[PDB]
């Protein structure tokens, strides 16, 4: 249940398993995943914390 309205009242099941397919690969950030650029800055050829 998300909202408090009835869009459609047909084709409703009762129960199931619905196991989430959790990925076995952990979050890998060694390539740059999950990072963004600083606002209005360049930071050319350097390392920064």
């Amino acid at each position: 249940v998300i909202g408090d309205f009835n869009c459609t009242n047909s084709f409703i099941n009762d129960y199931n398993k619905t196991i989430p397919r959790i990925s076995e690969d952990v979050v890998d950030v060694s390539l740059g995943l999950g990072t963004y650029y600083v606002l209005n800055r360049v930071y050319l050829n350097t390392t920064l914390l």
């Binding site: 249940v1 998300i2 909202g3 408090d4």
Partner: protein, 48 residues
């Protein structure tokens, strides 16, 4: 609407937070009890 005068300002004193699934709605199975202090009941929509 807070019915007040033409130059009245309303300010809060104690602000209480609560989760999304909440409503002061008693379950319809409160017809009678042994405490004789039954509160009024009302059906609340699904999702709480």
């Amino acid at each position: 609407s807070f019915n007040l005068s033409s130059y009245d300002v309303v300010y809060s004193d104690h602000c209480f937070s609560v989760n999304s699934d909440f409503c002061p709605c008693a379950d319809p199975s409160v017809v009678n009890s042994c405490a004789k202090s039954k509160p009024p009941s009302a059906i609340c929509p699904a999702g709480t």
